[PDB]
Symmetry: C3
Subunit: 270 residues, 3 copies
Amino acid sequence: AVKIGIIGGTGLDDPEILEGRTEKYVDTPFGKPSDALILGKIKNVDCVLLARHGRQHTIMPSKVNYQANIWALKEEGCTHVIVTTACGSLREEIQPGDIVIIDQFIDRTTMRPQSFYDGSHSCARGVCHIPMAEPFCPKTREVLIETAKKLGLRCHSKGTMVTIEGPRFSSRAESFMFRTWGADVINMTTVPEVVLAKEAGICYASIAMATDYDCWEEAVSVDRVLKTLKENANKAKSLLLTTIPQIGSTEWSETLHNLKNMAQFSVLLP
Amino acid sequence: AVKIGIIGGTGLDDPEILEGRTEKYVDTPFGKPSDALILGKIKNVDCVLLARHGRQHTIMPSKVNYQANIWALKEEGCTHVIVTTACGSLREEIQPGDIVIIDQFIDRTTMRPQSFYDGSHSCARGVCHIPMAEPFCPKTREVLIETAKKLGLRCHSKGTMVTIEGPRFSSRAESFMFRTWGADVINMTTVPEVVLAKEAGICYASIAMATDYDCWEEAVSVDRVLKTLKENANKAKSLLLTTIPQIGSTEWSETLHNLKNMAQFSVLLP
Amino acid sequence: AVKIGIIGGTGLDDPEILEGRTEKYVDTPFGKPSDALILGKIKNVDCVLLARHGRQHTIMPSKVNYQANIWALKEEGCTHVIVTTACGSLREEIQPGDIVIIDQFIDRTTMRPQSFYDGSHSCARGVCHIPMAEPFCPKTREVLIETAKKLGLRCHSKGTMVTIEGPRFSSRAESFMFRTWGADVINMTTVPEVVLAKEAGICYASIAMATDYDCWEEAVSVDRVLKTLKENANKAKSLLLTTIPQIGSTEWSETLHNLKNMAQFSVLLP
Ligand SMILES: CSC[C@H]1N[C@@H](c2c[nH]c3c2N=CNC3N)[C@H](O)[C@@H]1O
Ligand SMILES: CSC[C@H]1N[C@@H](c2c[nH]c3c2N=CNC3N)[C@H](O)[C@@H]1O
Ligand SMILES: CSC[C@H]1N[C@@H](c2c[nH]c3c2N=CNC3N)[C@H](O)[C@@H]1O
């Protein structure tokens, strides 16, 4: 049995996506999640929705409690976590409105805890060095890619997301630099969300929505980002609604088992 | 009416530059500024001088209260902020003693608050994502460039400053790496000073003074830096004294208005 | 007279290396070192062994008290510090099991104090900007290289170590990126250990042991790393045992004097 956690990003966290909704505030050893968990279903699949920045978008990327958010979803029984994230495009072929099923990331954050194993919680003892060669769940990404195709949506099958600390946008020198490093899209929230999900043994995948071209001719601004999201939000919603039932009808025993082992054996006990 | 804030860097924070001086210690919601504000004038233009590292250079780059410094200057009514900064040259053509009117930056700092919108002060509510495509005020930079020319000074019209956390200087591997990234000069103080100034809607420009060649044949050292500054400090002083009156005689209504809007609309309210 | 401090890394901190051992717990102005200092000798040379992650490997790289460790060794009278460190290879020619006598580093850490001069301890007053052009002691590295040759060990005479924050391993995008930056090996502990040693005027050198190929065909994992170390640990032990007596029989007056001056003159007093 699967349970899909859904973390909604900027202008992409609509609760109306789930049926039979029930609000549930929880606490974790790492503090409170961004907002209440929204329990519900898409067809016959159990889901748990969570607004990354709070339902009123009051939490900046740097201060999102990534540990609490992932912990709460795991505790609720989530086997999978599919998220949405607005991002800047660093490639001409990735136009605003396009969806990018990212498969890699480049960390540029500097003040964020990236592990549950900080030796402050008995629930997570030891030193954990989680592998990051393949940060995102390939099976889920495959379904997302095929579903986007079935929906006729402009979608990119791979992409490297560079995550900056923020809250400021990048300078032009940084923008051009990230391009040389191989980054394809840019945001402020992928890391450490994807890292903690890995440590928790959860299949994590991300629906990245290009909302601008950053500044590498109209430079990025908050208004430009919100406008693009307003015009394209429906795509991510349709993708999630169509993808989730497919996930709930496939086999994951071996996939989840492997993630469990990788996470477990990454821990160095005293 | 304009009011020019001046932040003086290493060996480039001489109070004698202003006439009719009055010392004024202030406090801000983010703590105390590096030192007392020095109120004064250059010709008929009101200025406010502040020593970035304290008048006795007792504050390391990592611990400079950038938020308090910019906040205090804004509160005092500064419309512009022109600063001086010693830096290492990462380009053969930028010789020690040369002035570089930087137009871009590459952030390498890791433990510095870069925004006033940290949700801890009612005076700055919400999440602010300030644009950084053009970090420095083009109009002020233009006057600085033309003034340096009128003064016959070796001056570079553009440059990318990479700001490292410090207090240690860079290794040779890092030095060579920054060159490949497109950095032209290197220091430990541009970021987040320029970022916070932007959020405050202030026209910010920086007079960068090359004091060494870092280590990419004599490698950089504190003594080498202080010596070069001692020999070239007069240039930055003359540039400021000559530039400021010109700024006070030009039009800024539209320029300041645009910066005000950009800063304002960058904030996401609940 | 010399005294060699030895910091042992993952699976490379065996106390049996020293004769006439005596355990000594100490405290420093920056807190307690990772574990008790192990006083002893190799032939007629005084040594002080310290397990970087604690004798039971309970301290993650991000939380190792680098300041306390280096301070304790200096206080004990160490003139030299030779360490061992497991690392990932970013170059085809550097095979697991190979030793790399690194000469440069690229910092990718973000939450680590890198200086003793944080203005919180009277023992270290002022602002210190220590040079990092040559982070490692060339004389010690030379002896290590010649000794490895005499021992018939596969050893690389130079190498750039990129130190990531961790505890997570790098993504593939980051791995490939570090290669383009010029990094040859990768770990989570070189920085700021080498930086603080420099500020303390200690001759620091590092015996890096490649334990994997990171993920740029079997990707890195904790088990793979521990296995390689188990099979190759003896090499580092033999290298240390053979190198140290040679260090104790050579001249260091001028070398230590120069490091003393560089460290001293890097400090800016009020
Ligand atoms: C309201 S725009 C800032 C948010 N949207 C994402 C974003 C969109 N476009 C860009 C973002 N982040 C960085 N650079 C960009 N060009 C980031 O993750 C923030 O949470
Ligand atoms: C006393 S030299 C260190 C200061 N001067 C600036 C500097 C000069 N030259 C270099 C600096 N910073 C980094 N690398 C360099 N090569 C930095 O911003 C520090 O505040
Ligand atoms: C138990 S493997 C993690 C530790 N070993 C070192 C290491 C070995 N191999 C790699 C390490 N660190 C980063 N990337 C790598 N491929 C790091 O410094 C950690 O202390």
